[model samples]
Target: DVIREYLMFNELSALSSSPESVRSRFSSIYGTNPDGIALNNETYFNAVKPPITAQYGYYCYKNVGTVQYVNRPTDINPNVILAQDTLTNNTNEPFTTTITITGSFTNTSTVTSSTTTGFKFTSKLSIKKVFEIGGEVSFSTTIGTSETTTETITVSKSVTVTVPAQSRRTIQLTAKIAKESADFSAPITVDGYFGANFPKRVGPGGHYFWFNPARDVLNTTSGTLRGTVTNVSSFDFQTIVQPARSL
Candidate 1:
């Protein structure tokens, strides 16, 4: 029973959150079971095993998407450019005038951390964005025959960017607003674990989790660690469709 207690102490102290890791540790105990120890019992082992949920619970994890744009104290002039566009006139009427209206302008912003200057935790970065265009009928006319009237339509343009920690990386966004038809393309979504975490899993049971910090728990080692990059941008805009047709 003394050997079993020692093994149990090491397993719980390590507090490995992986179910597989927990099972492996449990297997070790089962293999060395003296006689009828319940800790190695199949039902008991399955019941007490830890989960991935707990794996992340001990430490704070943050996921920062790719840096599409960045705004900082060092930034000077604006990096984005705005361009004008015209729409098509399908009807017999001649448009007396044409005008271009602006929608949501690109924003300048940054993310801040809650912890003080020096803190320890994993930092992850990824990029994502969507391009959306909408059309509005400017004018309409009836089939009079004698005198014809002109009408126009407008396209609404907008883009979104997902970024990571403070950086200088930037991209140019160009969108055309025209008659009836509109174009929209956005980045697809990603799922699952990302970035790096400390105390990676050991053979089976040699990982540790700290609920309430004990001695040496807060004594982090030196050196800065950068998290994994999950996504990146090529900065190329392709014209999928032309909005000449009537919406």
Candidate 2:
């Protein structure tokens, strides 16, 4: 049915990549289904089986006895950080730029730490060296065409902490007046890539996948629209883990 075709159109990361936005779109579309089951269209072919694999496809199951993870990126052990964006630099006189990172974080299986209550984690940031110019305004769109300038910073840092069971967290970090602009009031923004990883990694004996189908299908009405963040520092790292008794 064309309805399924429409769903396919709405489910690819190439569409909207933003996890939050994508999840909302997917929720609305899936909720419209007769049984509200997330199904993979037949197009996926035999790589996946079916009883209408959509619902079962929403998520796959992994039950390992030793320290294991609940979900991961496209392949198992993907570098921890999948997507990250610091807040756009403010192009105004206040000369303010706040950085924030938004994406989905899940502790679906369960993570615990012996040294700390929350899991210990580290973040590696890939500084965008070039100062890219875009549109009539330099810092107007996050999903537009732009030119790059230079890179003066190259550094890596780590942060450690813990998250509870079956829990998901969204992190927002802000930094103000990191740089100055030629135009006193012409708001400025900075673009870069960063990632997070767990030092001690493990497995669920399978690779896990997370996707926001709707965001994966994003487009634009005005300026040029582009793909999701892929230039970050990593692709695969380690899964969160704790002792077996902790689970």
* Each prediction's whole-model lDDT (CA): 0.25, 0.24
Candidate 2 residue lDDT tens string, 125-174: 11121211210112222212223333232222233333334332333222
Per-residue error for 210 in candidate 1, Å, reads 31
For model 2, the stretches where C-alpha displacement exceeds 4 angstroms are: 1-40, 51-53, 57-209, 217-247
lDDT score, candidate 2: 0.24
Clash pairs, model 1 backbone = 14-207, 65-126, 65-163, 66-126, 66-127, 66-163, 66-164, 93-149, 93-150, 180-247
- Candidate 1 residue-pair clash tally: 10
Instruction: Quote model 1's TM-score.
Output: 0.17
